[PDB]
UniProtKB/Swiss-Prot annotation:
The gene is ACVR1. The chain holds residues 202 to 499 of 509 of the full protein. It is found in: Membrane. The active site is at residue 133. This is Activin receptor type-1. It is an enzyme of class 2 (transferase). Interacts with FKBP1A. Interacts with FCHO1. Interacts with CLU. Interacts with type II receptors AMHR2 and ACVR2A. Interacts with BMP7. Interacts with GDF2/BMP9. Interacts with BMP6 (when glycosylated); the interaction may induce HAMP expression. Interacts with TSC22D1/TSC-22. It catalyses: L-threonyl-[receptor-protein] + ATP = O-phospho-L-threonyl-[receptor-protein] + ADP + H(+); L-seryl-[receptor-protein] + ATP = O-phospho-L-seryl-[receptor-protein] + ADP + H(+). Belongs to the protein kinase superfamily. TKL Ser/Thr protein kinase family. TGFB receptor subfamily. The lineage of its organism: Eukaryota, Metazoa, Chordata, Craniata, Vertebrata. GO terms for molecular function: activin binding; activin receptor activity, type I; ATP binding; BMP receptor activity; cadherin binding; metal ion binding; peptide hormone binding; protein homodimerization activity. Residues 1-283 are cytoplasmic.
Amino acid sequence: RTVARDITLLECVGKGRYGEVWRGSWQGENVAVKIFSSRDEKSWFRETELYNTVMLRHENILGFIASDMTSRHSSTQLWLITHYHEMGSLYDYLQLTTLDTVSCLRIVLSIASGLAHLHIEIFGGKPAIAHRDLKSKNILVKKNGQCCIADLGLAVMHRVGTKRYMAPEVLDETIQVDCFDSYKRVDIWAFGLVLWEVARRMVSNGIVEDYKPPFYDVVPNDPSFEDMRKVVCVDQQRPNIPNRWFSDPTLTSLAKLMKECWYQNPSARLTALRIKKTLTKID
Ligand SMILES: COc1cc(-c2cncc(-c3ccc(C4CCN(C)CC4)cc3)c2C)cc(OC)c1OC
Ligand SMILES: COc1cc(-c2cncc(-c3ccc(C4CCN(C)CC4)cc3)c2C)cc(OC)c1OC
Ligand SMILES: COc1cc(-c2cncc(-c3ccc(C4CCN(C)CC4)cc3)c2C)cc(OC)c1OC
């Protein structure tokens, strides 16, 4: 039998320290092809090892297709091939798009659904998984209005995370590194920041905030580890909740939820399953 492995790389949709992502075509169908830099080779190995352990299949997890290693003259070429989401990342989407109540809730409940699926151990199943780099650039928007979580290059089963999204216990090096629940709680902190990024873009009473990344008003454009530690750990700052949210029942409920993701004490933070339950009882 013929094994068609040719992928036509059509356009670069992402370039960074990690390498590149391309829209490609296989057998008439869009795929996304991540080509790894030498800097980020260990992310290909980690994600490949995870999918070799458990073939994750969930509507709110970016769909795996293949891991490819190809011998070249004096290098190894590493590709991760996934489903393609033409709307691009949540970060991208929120820059020009505003949201209504329905769209805002659909986005954040879909993210909580993906994250709870990663976190939960299933017997008979899947190991529990912590993401370790959850942020709006690692979430894709689907045409049906739900999102999916991407990039399991730093994931742990039972490179550092993006500094702007690091929890206080990562910044102050108190994280209990021999407790898997510690890594779930770091993801919940980051989830609360993503929830703040999305809620800002939800219109109420003709008002919306501009897209900004978390802590935009208190750290530099490219913040250092120390910059983040001083804000989050020493001064114990949290993202601003605008007054206009307290006129809107949805944004009032979302402000309470994000506060419960941002406790200094990691064991006080909500679980992903509790976040799901709370979201299903809003609006
Ligand atoms: C090697 O590499 C790539 C392969 C493919 C691909 C292309 N056609 C057919 C296949 C296929 C799948 C499954 C079987 C089964 C049949 C039943 N039996 C119980 C075991 C074997 C056979 C063949 C594949 C996997 C695509 C690729 O890219 C999209 C590949 O490159 C990453
Ligand atoms: C990697 O990705 C894609 C792969 C394929 C693809 C191509 N040839 C054959 C297969 C296949 C056939 C049969 C079995 C099973 C059936 C039951 N039992 C007997 C065990 C063996 C498995 C696999 C597939 C799945 C198509 C895709 O898209 C349409 C893929 O997605 C891009
Ligand atoms: C976060 O990480 C990964 C993401 C992806 C991925 C999957 N579907 C679609 C995309 C994409 C497509 C198109 C645009 C643009 C095109 C220009 N227009 C003006 C706005 C939209 C952006 C993004 C990506 C980047 C795949 C990955 O692996 C193969 C990723 O890494 C795990």
